[PDB]
Each structure stands twice: as C-alpha cells, then as structure tokens.
C-alpha cells in the first residue's frame, strides 16, 4: 500500500496547528509542580498537526529528535522529570470531551503564551501535560481535547 | 483555471479548526453580544478552516448560508445590532501577531465556551469580533491571529 | 456555595481541636486566621475534590486539614495551642457564581479559639 | 507581607487610592491581586478580584488598578458606611504561597 505523502508529525513550522487528545487525564500539582503548580497529563495521547493532517501517539514518538524549523525542541524547566517543550503562539484552548465544558491555564489573565510539555523516558513510554489553574474539568480520568497554534523557538 | 477541489469554508462541521485573522483590530466596550461587554473587532477580517485549508474574507461571506452541519448559524440578537454565531468547544486561543503577548477571554476563569460573533449589513460589508476582557493587547490598531475549534450546535 | 462553620472552641494551652467546614464542585476551601489588631495571614488551602493540603511554609507543623468526601466537610486541626493562637479563625473557599481565582468568597462565621487557662 | 499604609483620611466628596507594593515579580508580572472589607466585628467581604473585578454586590464606587509595582483601590464619591480596614492579596508564585496586606484604616474625616 503506497497512499498519499505528507510533512511528518516530528517537523513542526512555527504556527502550525496542535490538537493533541488527553483521554482519561489527571490533574496534577506533584509531577511538574515542585510547590503549587497545575496541570492536567496523561498515560496515553495523540497529538495530530492539523495543518498536515498526520497524527501519532506521544508514547510512539521519537522526541529525541523532534524539531521545530530544523532544531531540536527547547527544555526550559525540569521539575519532577525531564520535560520536552512544545511552545505556542496565544494559549491553550482546551475542553471535556464532547460538552462546551471549557478549561483554562495557570496564567489565566495573562499575555504569557502557554506552551506544551511532554515527559519521554527515551523508549515507548510518553505523558502529555497541559496547563491547568484549579480542577475546572475534574479529578480524573478526564477526557481532554487541547488546541493550540505552535510559535518561534526562543 | 480549474484547480483541486476541496469542502467549502461556509460549509463547517462540529470540530473543524477555527483560524482567524483580524487584521488592525479596535477594542470594543458597549458594542458587542450584550451590554457592557469587551471584546476586539476588525472591518477586514480573513477566516480559514485549517480543515480543509479554505480561507475567505468576513465581509465577502453569505452569512446568509454558513451552515453548520446543514443547519443554519444561530443568529442572535444584541443590545444593537443581530448577530452571526459560530460556537467552540474550549475558549478563543488569540494573540498579538508575531510575539508571544498573548490575549484573554471575558470569562477567562470559568468553564464557559466562547464564541465566535460576526456583524453582516447583507451585502459586502462584514466584521468580526473575538472576546476579551481588557485592552491587554493595545487600543488599536492591534494586528491579532485568533484560533480555535468549532462545537455543536444548541 | 455557601459556607457554614463550626461554634467557639475554648481550650487549654497545649491541645488539639478540630474545625468543622461545611459547604453547599471545584470548591477549594482555604482558611487564614485573625490576629486581634493585626492583619490577616492565610495558613491553609486544601482541594476537598483531591484530598491534598498545602500549607504554608510557617505554619503546617500545627495545623492538620483533611478533607471529608462524603458530606463536602474541612476540618481545621491546631495541635500545640497558645496564648499567642487565641485568634478568630475564618474557613474560606474561592467563588464568583461560576469564576474561581486567586481570591477568597465566602466566609465562615468565624470560630472563636479562646486559649488560656 | 504586603507593604500597605494605614492612614487613610479625607473629605466625602473626594476619591483615594491605598497602596500595595508587592516583589518586582508578583506584582508587575503575576496579577491576582484581591481587596476586602472588614466592618468592626465582622467576617471580611470580597470588594476586589483578580487586580480589576467587582463581584455582583460591590457598589461601582470600587475601582481596582496596577501601576507596574504598585496596586491601588480606587474610591471615588466616597460613602458614609465605609469605615473599615482595607486589605490587599496576591498569591505570589514564589516560596510564599499568599501574601496579604498590613491593612488600611478608613476614617473618612466628617
């Protein structure tokens, strides 16, 4: 089977369009939050780069070399774990599955643009986490469904 | 010249993303959705369905026919004006073009689903207007890159 | 949500006491007690959805708050008790009719920690 | 705690403005900043939320506002059953979890 090729998932141009799924997501203030902090993760994900249409487990990446314009992703922070950076132009818009139940991030009246982050121990095995402000969706398991619009590496 | 052919831009489906340009936007207090309520506008607006990767202007758009699953847009009537609505599940992910100064939503703490809101005279004349809740990217003119993702309709 | 708490608790300095919380989802029920004629200083700040309580860093060795599920109950246990903890306690959760932030609304009645002998 | 005056007087017919400055850090970049109100022998009211946000209760007298490190309640067309302490709270996003104010003293001189 020889289908139709695209741009992989792996090559990220800064504003390309994000939807990554967080079926049964937690919140969390102890994994990447060495205080306070929140943010919703989860064992198994998918995200799928809407602009070309291709889609792909975290767990089933090699994040080693994911780039954004021909360079390997960022990692500004590093607490409980290590931690990929996806950066995002705006914040995240994301939402309970199926109802308009929305979530909001940390900086919830802020101009600081939210980004992504993604814990990988180097072989089949990835969690996605999103920024969250309180339990506005639930304890978990969580069905989320986060968009966002990727920006330029720092 | 008759190129590829894909699905219309007036022609959305409950999860189709959402991009939205308003190029040199205003900010805007008592004139929008409902009585002393913020958000930014533009005259020219572009609007994309990162979908199928039709884009078109707001004010060269039937609103007249954009549907939504072959039902419609619930238009709903303001203080002053009528207004075009096409809703999202999560809320308006939109920032200031280029740098990271990203904006905020009027319900930028709750599990409210924001919407999209567009002014249509009936012929060529079309503005679009995008929540907010402070002047958080400027007076105006204010270049903004709104994003988000389509919910089913009431 | 509303906010019901607990009558005056006079004590022995050196014991331990409970506060009741009750309340009428998401609530996260903090509370900051009242030095008299000084300012408030907020101590506690547990998420009854989650069970986990993050006190602050001078308190936490005295204060003890769990988080009862079943009837959506805080309680606030001060151990060690003084004359210098004789103050008016308040148990506050954060709401806006459907925002929650960095604030607090309601407030408890205030339960009165009279300590001395 | 959160650096704020107390000595608050002035005419009926006149606005304030109480101080609150905060850390470079939590105050000009972090903005969370909350006002209440506590009338002699009484339970503390939310007046402020957020540096700039009335609940539906608040008269509009109530104006909140940031001027890069320093926060300011704004009272302006003062009222006759204002006398009470003024406090000011950000939650800091450093080792301090929340900050409350040294609490303003209203005397509105009549």
């Known amino acids: 089977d020889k289908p139709a090729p695209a741009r992989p998932i792996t090559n990220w141009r800064s504003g390309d369009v994000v939807w990554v799924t967080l079926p049964s997501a937690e919140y969390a203030q102890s994994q990447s939050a060495m205080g306070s902090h929140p943010a919703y993760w989860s064992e198994e994900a998918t995200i799928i780069n809407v602009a070309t249409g291709q889609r792909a487990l975290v767990s089933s990446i090699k994040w080693d070399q994911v780039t954004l314009n021909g360079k390997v992703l960022h990692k500004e922070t590093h607490s409980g774990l290590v931690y990929y950076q996806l950066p995002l132009m705006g914040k995240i818009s994301f939402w309970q599955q199926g109802t308009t139940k929305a979530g909001y991030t940390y900086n919830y009246n802020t101009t600081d643009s939210d980004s992504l982050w993604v814990w990988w121990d180097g072989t089949s095995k990835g969690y996605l986490y999103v920024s969250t402000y309180t339990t506005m969706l639930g304890a978990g398991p969580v069905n989320i469904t986060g968009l966002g619009a990727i920006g330029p590496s720092p | 010249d008759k190129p590829a052919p894909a699905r219309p831009i007036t022609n959305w489906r409950s999860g189709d993303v959402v991009w939205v340009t308003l190029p040199s936007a205003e900010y805007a207090q008592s004139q929008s959705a409902m009585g002393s309520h913020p958000a930014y506008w533009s005259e020219e607006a572009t609007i994309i369905n990162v979908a199928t990767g039709q884009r078109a202007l707001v004010s060269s758009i039937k609103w007249d026919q954009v549907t939504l699953n072959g039902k419609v847009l619930h238009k709903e009537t303001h203080s002053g004006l009528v207004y075009y609505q096409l809703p999202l599940m999560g809320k308006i992910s939109f920032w200031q073009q280029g740098t990271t100064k990203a904006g905020y939503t009027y319900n930028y703490n709750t599990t409210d689903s924001d919407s999209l809101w567009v002014w249509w005279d009936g012929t060529s004349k079309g503005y679009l207007y995008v929540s907010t809740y402070t002047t958080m990217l400027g007076a105006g003119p204010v270049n903004i890159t709104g994003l988000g993702a389509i919910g089913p309709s009431p | 949500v509303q906010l019901v708490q607990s009558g005056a608790e006079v004590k022995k300095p050196g014991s331990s006491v409970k506060v009741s919380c009750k309340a009428s989802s998401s609530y996260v029920i903090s509370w900051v007690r009242q030095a008299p004629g000084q300012g408030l200083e907020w101590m506690g700040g547990?998420?009854?959805?989650?069970?986990?309580?993050n006190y602050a860093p001078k308190f936490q060795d005295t204060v003890t708050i769990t988080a009862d599920k079943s009837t959506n109950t805080v309680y606030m246990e001060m151990r060690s008790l003084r004359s210098e903890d004789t103050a008016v306690y308040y148990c506050?959760?954060?709401?806006?009719?459907?925002?929650?932030?960095?604030?607090?609304?309601?407030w408890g009645q205030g339960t009165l920690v009279t300590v001395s002998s | 705690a959160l650096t704020q005056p107390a000595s608050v007087s002035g005419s009926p017919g006149q606005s304030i403005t109480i101080s609150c400055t905060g850390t470079?850090?939590?105050?000009?970049?972090?903005?969370?900043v909350s006002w209440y109100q506590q009338h002699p022998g009484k339970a503390p009211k939310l007046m402020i939320f957020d540096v700039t946000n009335r609940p539906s209760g608040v008269s509009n007298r109530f104006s909140g506002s940031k001027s890069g490190n320093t926060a300011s309640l704004t009272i302006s067309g003062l009222q006759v059953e204002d006398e009470a302490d003024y406090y000011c709270s950000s939650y800091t996003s450093t080792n301090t979890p929340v900050v409350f104010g040294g609490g303003t003293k209203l005397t509105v001189l009549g």
């Open positions: 470079s850090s939590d105050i000009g970049d972090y903005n969370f």
């Open positions: 506050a959760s954060n709401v806006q009719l459907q925002r929650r932030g960095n604030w607090f609304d309601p």
């Open positions: 547990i998420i009854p959805i989650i069970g986990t309580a």
